[PDB]
């Protein structure tokens, strides 16, 4: 019963996963279908195919609640950063404004030890 025509697609594309959330402009999530939600597991959730199915699922579920017009906040150093937003484009949302919101620490918390692989 919650009807809102405008929204924001927050996209988090980490080296393992992609998470697409559709919120109102105020910032209240409605749909969040992610790369595990679309059938995937393990290392296959890092792939752009999983990205462009998770974004499609999020887009359709958000349209079911009535969003035509989304603006995208993308974040993360993952490979599903463009496949996802074209998936939202081609699943019926209008892309609107595109930004980048990847956090940039002003040399704050000490990072974990480098992998000796």
């Amino acid at each position: 019963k919650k009807n809102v025509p405008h929204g924001a697609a927050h996209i988090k594309s980490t080296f393992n996963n992609t998470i697409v959330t559709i919120t109102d402009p105020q910032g209240n999530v409605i749909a969040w279908a992610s790369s595990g939600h679309v059938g995937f597991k393990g290392s296959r959730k890092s792939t752009p195919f999983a990205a462009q199915l998770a974004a499609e699922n999020a887009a359709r579920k958000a349209q079911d609640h009535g969003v035509r017009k989304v603006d995208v906040f993308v974040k993360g150093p993952g490979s599903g950063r463009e496949t996802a937003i074209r998936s939202l484009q081609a699943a019926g949302l209008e892309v609107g404004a595109i930004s980048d919101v990847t956090p940039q620490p002003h040399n704050g918390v000490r990072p974990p030890n480098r992998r000796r692989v």
Partner: peptide, 8 residues
């Protein structure tokens, strides 16, 4: 089709 995920 179940391995399309590796088409890249």
């Amino acid at each position: 089709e179940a391995n399309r995920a590796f088409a890249h």
